[PDB]
Design a binder for this molecule. Sequence first.
Ligand SMILES: [K+]
Ligand SMILES: [Mg+2]
Lengths: 60, 50, 221, 159, 228, 95
Amino acid sequence: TSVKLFPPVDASYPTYVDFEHATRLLDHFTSRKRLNYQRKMIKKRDKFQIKSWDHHAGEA
Amino acid sequence: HRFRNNKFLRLEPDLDPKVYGQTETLQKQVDDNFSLLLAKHRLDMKAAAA
Amino acid sequence: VYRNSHTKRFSCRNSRLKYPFEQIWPTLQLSEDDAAMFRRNSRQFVVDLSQNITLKNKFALNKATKIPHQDARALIYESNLHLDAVGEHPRYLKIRRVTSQYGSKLMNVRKLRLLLGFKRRNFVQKLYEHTLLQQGSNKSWKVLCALEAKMNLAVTRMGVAEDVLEATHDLRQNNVTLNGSPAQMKHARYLEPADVLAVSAVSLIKQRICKGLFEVAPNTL
Amino acid sequence: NNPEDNIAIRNAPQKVFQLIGDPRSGVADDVTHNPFGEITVEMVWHQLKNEVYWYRYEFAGQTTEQSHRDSRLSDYTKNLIYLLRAKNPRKWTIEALAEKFHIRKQRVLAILALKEMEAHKIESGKQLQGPLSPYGLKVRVEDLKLLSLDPTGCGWVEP
Amino acid sequence: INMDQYLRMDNQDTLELLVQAKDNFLKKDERTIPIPQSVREVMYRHRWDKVIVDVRRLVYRTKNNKREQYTAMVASGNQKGLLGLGMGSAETAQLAVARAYLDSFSNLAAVPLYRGHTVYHHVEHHFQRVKVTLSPRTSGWGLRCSNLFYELCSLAGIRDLTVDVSGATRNKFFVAKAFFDALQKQTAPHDGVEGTGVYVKEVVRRPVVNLGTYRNNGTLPPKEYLAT
Amino acid sequence: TTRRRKLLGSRYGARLAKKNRQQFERARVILDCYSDEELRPDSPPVAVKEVTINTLQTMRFLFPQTSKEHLDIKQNIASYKIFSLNRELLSLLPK
Ligand SMILES: [K+]
Ligand SMILES: [Mg+2]
């Protein structure tokens, strides 16, 4: 059995990973539509709210 | 001491874990100690009785 | 896609190395010829010194023990005329151009897919988008945290699977439980700092570990 | 509490106060460098039979040392934490135990949970059976005394 | 292969190698390596990286045939606070690059940076028929710029910045030169501080965005401005 | 074609409370369930008297030296174990 404790402070991988190069490419394909849907759901986490069931077009 | 290598004066070698199993070897070691104690009581009774 | 690029032998390709491929699977058994091919990326010959040096020796010559994670790229792939390329005329030193970035950036994204267990590109793209909204100041570390929060990678860290691919198969068979019951959205969720993982296929996992270490176990109990 | 034998004292927050100028006429903070550290990477291992390299990333590598000790505490230490908590929960709080063993509070609570689960298995009769039975020990909390290394050198005294 | 010898070589002290390498490099003549001896000594205190900026070909016609000449620019700099540009001309591309690389070490210069990762304030520079803008960003935000400037930022050590370049950018020598000059127009809080009679103290203030950004994201600015 | 029975899980505490209530109550006190106001149970806390530990490593893996310090630790554990066995035996010896 294992238990997690907190956000990692160290990590080891069997190879060198260049995160800056990986993210530079991925920053070119970002979708504003998907980001906006995520932003709206952050403000509507609580199901037991009146304001979470208003009239809107689409999913959020 | 003539038995330089056989320091513990054993009659049989210890069981190999890779062939007989770790649990079997551990049980064998426990049985060996009890046999030594039992033999000691066995010799004394025979001498006292006969 | 029954390609060789989807096998462990040829999974990773790096065009900046003498041998274009790279070994990243710590449990893969290589033949003598295969080992020789990979060893060419580890040993280099120095003219003035007339000796062979290794990648680890190169770091020592540069006095590099803990360096900024962006600076390791300049050490692995470049050369210097005062430490490791002494005796070579400057005319024959290799200097990169700004046109090589695309190959490098594409390679790194392939590495993230390989570490996660041969995931699709759209899977990685959404993972990057997810981190953009989570709180934190350093973008690079947020990406690293997201990788660790993945369930299959966490199972690998426990030490019950040979690699991430074997861990993924275990999840599909429900050999590991989350908070006492099989996980929901196990391939898409993230683990939290208070989650508990346990093995439900106890007999299966115990056999797996014993067999792996049977040869390295001592013959005296 | 000496830096030679106290890694925790070595890994302590630093109070930084650096200036440029003349304190009698005018000064300004020195902001020409970053003394708080940054993310680092290091090569740890190299397998010569498979040609595999291992790299380790650390969030605070430049301001910490020997961070690998925290997650590799001996079994004796873990049992001691479990016994101290059971003996006197009033004094042995999570804060006190964390300070005593130089670990975090989250680790202390996690260790207690795992030890508690193991104890139930032993009591239920699922572990330490057969030849290994003698190694399951039942301890009464009252009959427990913690010794201290008060005398310089080798030797543990009751108080 | 002998694995035992391979292991022995891998785990060895490199002090002997360092001494031999340093002696050989410092004893070379000024023709093969025209780097001054003083510069060679400093090369062992840092880690260096280099990149090619651009290669141009010039053609001169004659009675019978044409004469081709190559010019190149190479940028080199230690990871933190050192950058230099060198130019070299030769009859071949390979020779021009080599001469430019050697010339870069003779043009090293210091780059001021706030905490070693960004710029002190907004910078706008006008090199002939080129415009470059630099905007500071919070630590950890990242770099937003073209590929050419991304390579230059790695050499100097800049970690968070936004760069925008416009105008006649066909000649990449001018673009690199404009970027170099912009970094040298910054001002620091400690410039002539003795004549102020005050304590110039660093403070923590979060930057803001424009109103349109808040509306689109559906978020709010700091409460200090919303007070009503 | 699988003969493996379907697995529907449950939390560890849920199963323990139905199998051994005494162990469940002890765990709550140890795991600091009475410090937070929100999570504080209504039932009063129970005092902890006996615990069980595993000493296999401390006896045969961790203390190899011949100094008095290591010998004393092993002897104390062995002596305490014998007392526990004797107390159990005395409860059964009388006719
Ligand atoms: K793909
Ligand atoms: Mg533009």
